Amino acid sequence: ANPNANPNANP
Amino acid sequence: XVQLXXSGGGXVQXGXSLXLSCXAXXXXXXXXXXXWXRQXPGXXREXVXXXXXXXXXXXXXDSXXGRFTXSXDXXXXXXXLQXXXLXXXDXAXYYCXXXXXXXXXXXXXXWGXGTXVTVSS
Amino acid sequence: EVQLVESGGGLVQPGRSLRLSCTASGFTFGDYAMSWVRQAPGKGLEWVGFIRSKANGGRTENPASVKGRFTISRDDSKSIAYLQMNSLKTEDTAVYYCTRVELGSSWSLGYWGQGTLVTVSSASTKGPSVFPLAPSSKSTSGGTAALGCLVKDYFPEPVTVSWNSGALTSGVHTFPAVLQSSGLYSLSSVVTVPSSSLGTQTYICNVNHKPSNTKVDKKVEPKSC
Amino acid sequence: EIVLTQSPGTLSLSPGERATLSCRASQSVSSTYLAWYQQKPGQAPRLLIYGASSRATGIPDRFSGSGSGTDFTLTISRLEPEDFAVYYCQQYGSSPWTFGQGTKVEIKRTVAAPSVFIFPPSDEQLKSGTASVVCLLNNFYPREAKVQWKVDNALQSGNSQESVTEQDSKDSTYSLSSTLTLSKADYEKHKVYACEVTHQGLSSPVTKSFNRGEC
Structure with a gap:
C-alpha cells in the first residue's frame, strides 16, 4: 500500500 | 422486424407439468427483460412472470408463485416458463412480450400470438 | 462498548465554516487512526479523510474533493476527533460519520458513529x-x-x-x-x-x-x- | 482512483434464501485491503467483513467473504429479516479510499401493478402564478416504473420531479409521485395534460389525463 493510503504507519 | 413465437402449450391433467418456450426473431434479447402474460376467454389479461437480464432475477404473479419458474437462454434468444402443479384455473392463452426498456419499466412493444394451455380431466 | 458520537452538524451557508466533533469512548482512542466518511442524501459513501495516531505522525490525508478545505484534527486528552470544514459548498451536504480505523495490516473502518447532518444551502427560511x-x-x-x-x-x-x-x-x-x-x-x-x-x-x-x-x-x- | 463496481444494483430475495453480492475493482486490489459494510434503513453503516474474508466482531456466521485481484464476493448463506439492507464494498489499499456504489438487498414480493391517479392544479396555486400537475402511482412492485408526461401529446422533459416512498413495511410495495410544474402562462397555452405509466405488471400503458378547465 502506498504511504498516503496507510493510516497505521508513519509515512 | 421483431417477432415472438410461443410454443409448448397443450392439454395437461391437473397436477401436471408443461414447459412453454418463447423464441424471438429480428432482435437479440440479451439486454431485455421478457415477460409472460395469460388471458382466458372473457377475462382480463394477467401478468404471469418476468425474467430480467441475467443476475437481475425473476418476478412472479400471486397466482403462480411457487409453481412456475421463468428462465432464459440469452444465446438462444429464448425464454421459458416451466409450469408445475397445474390447476384448471391456469387454463388460458399464454403470451410472451419483450420489455423494450432496459431499465425495466415494462415497455411491452412486441408480443407473441400466444400458446393455449388447458388443464382438464 | 465502542461508541462514537458526532456533533456540530447543522444548516450553514456556502463559503462558511463548520467544525464537527466526534467524541470517542470505549477504547484507547490515542492509539487509533480516525476517519470521516460522508453520505449525501440518497447517495452512497464517500471517504473524506483520515488522521493518523500521534505515534504514527498524527498527520492527515484527504481526497481531492475536500483537500485544502477540510482539516481533520484530534485532541487525544479529550478523546475527540474533529472535522474543520471551511469554504463549504452546497455539494458538501451530507451526513458525516466519524469512524475508528482498525489497527494492524487491514485498516478497515471497524466502528461508526450515528452521524451528524450538514446541510449547506443559500436558501432562507420559507413556510410552505x-x-x-x-x-x-x-x-x-x-x-x-x-x-x-x-x-x-x-x-x-x-x-x-x-x-x-x-x-x-x-x-x-x-x-x-x-x-x-x-x-x-x-x-x-x-x-x-x-x-x-x-x-x-x-x-x-x-x-x-x-x-x-x-x-x-x-x-x-x-x-x- | 480505484473504482469499485457492485452488482447487481438490487437483489430481491426472500428470508431463508442465499444472497451473493459482487464487487469488481478497476484494478487489482490486495485482499487485505477490501472490506464490506452493511447499512440498515435509517442507520449508520457497520463493518461486516475486512481483508476480503474476515468477519468483524459480532458478525454472524451466515456472512462470508471471498475474492482476490479484481473480483470480490459477499455471501449471506441464509437471509434473516434484519439482513435486508444496502451493502457497500470498500478498498483502502490505494488513495483515495473508495466505496462501491452499493447493492440493495430488498425483500421480494409478488408483482403488483400500480394504481394510477392524476391531480389537476388547484385554482389557488394557479392564482399565484404556477401550475403543478401530480401523477400518483400507488402500491406497486417491483420498484421500476416509467412516468411520461404528455402535454397535447408532446413528451415533456426537464420540468418534472419524482419521489418514491421507502418499501412499505406491511405490503412491501412502493409508491411514486411525479410532479410536472409549469408557469401559469405556459399551463394556459395547452389543453390536454396526461401522465402515461408503464410497469412490468401492466400489459399496456395506463394513461390518466384531464383537460385544462375540465375540473
Whole structure:
C-alpha cells in the first residue's frame, strides 16, 4: 500500500 | 422486424407439468427483460412472470408463485416458463412480450400470438 | 462498548465554516487512526479523510474533493476527533460519520458513529404553500379515490403532515421531499379513501413547518370532473 | 482512483434464501485491503467483513467473504429479516479510499401493478402564478416504473420531479409521485395534460389525463 493510503504507519 | 413465437402449450391433467418456450426473431434479447402474460376467454389479461437480464432475477404473479419458474437462454434468444402443479384455473392463452426498456419499466412493444394451455380431466 | 458520537452538524451557508466533533469512548482512542466518511442524501459513501495516531505522525490525508478545505484534527486528552470544514459548498451536504480505523495490516473502518447532518444551502427560511390534490374521476380507481395535499416551496426540512388530525393513517403516503432548483423543498402527501366517503367525510391535511411557525389545515374538496 | 463496481444494483430475495453480492475493482486490489459494510434503513453503516474474508466482531456466521485481484464476493448463506439492507464494498489499499456504489438487498414480493391517479392544479396555486400537475402511482412492485408526461401529446422533459416512498413495511410495495410544474402562462397555452405509466405488471400503458378547465 502506498504511504498516503496507510493510516497505521508513519509515512 | 421483431417477432415472438410461443410454443409448448397443450392439454395437461391437473397436477401436471408443461414447459412453454418463447423464441424471438429480428432482435437479440440479451439486454431485455421478457415477460409472460395469460388471458382466458372473457377475462382480463394477467401478468404471469418476468425474467430480467441475467443476475437481475425473476418476478412472479400471486397466482403462480411457487409453481412456475421463468428462465432464459440469452444465446438462444429464448425464454421459458416451466409450469408445475397445474390447476384448471391456469387454463388460458399464454403470451410472451419483450420489455423494450432496459431499465425495466415494462415497455411491452412486441408480443407473441400466444400458446393455449388447458388443464382438464 | 465502542461508541462514537458526532456533533456540530447543522444548516450553514456556502463559503462558511463548520467544525464537527466526534467524541470517542470505549477504547484507547490515542492509539487509533480516525476517519470521516460522508453520505449525501440518497447517495452512497464517500471517504473524506483520515488522521493518523500521534505515534504514527498524527498527520492527515484527504481526497481531492475536500483537500485544502477540510482539516481533520484530534485532541487525544479529550478523546475527540474533529472535522474543520471551511469554504463549504452546497455539494458538501451530507451526513458525516466519524469512524475508528482498525489497527494492524487491514485498516478497515471497524466502528461508526450515528452521524451528524450538514446541510449547506443559500436558501432562507420559507413556510410552505399548501395546495389540495383534489379527488375526481381522474383520481378514482374502482371504489377507491385518491386525494392529497401538495406542500410546496419550503425551507428548511422538515414538514409534518397529518390527515384529519391523525384519524386518517392507513394508505397515507407522505413522499420524501424533493429539493428544487430554487433551493426550496416540496412534497406531496396522498391517501386513498372510499369513493363513497367523499360525500360523508371531510378530508383535511394538517401541515406544520416549525422553522417558519407555519400551521395550515387545508380542506381537500372533491371536484366534479 | 480505484473504482469499485457492485452488482447487481438490487437483489430481491426472500428470508431463508442465499444472497451473493459482487464487487469488481478497476484494478487489482490486495485482499487485505477490501472490506464490506452493511447499512440498515435509517442507520449508520457497520463493518461486516475486512481483508476480503474476515468477519468483524459480532458478525454472524451466515456472512462470508471471498475474492482476490479484481473480483470480490459477499455471501449471506441464509437471509434473516434484519439482513435486508444496502451493502457497500470498500478498498483502502490505494488513495483515495473508495466505496462501491452499493447493492440493495430488498425483500421480494409478488408483482403488483400500480394504481394510477392524476391531480389537476388547484385554482389557488394557479392564482399565484404556477401550475403543478401530480401523477400518483400507488402500491406497486417491483420498484421500476416509467412516468411520461404528455402535454397535447408532446413528451415533456426537464420540468418534472419524482419521489418514491421507502418499501412499505406491511405490503412491501412502493409508491411514486411525479410532479410536472409549469408557469401559469405556459399551463394556459395547452389543453390536454396526461401522465402515461408503464410497469412490468401492466400489459399496456395506463394513461390518466384531464383537460385544462375540465375540473
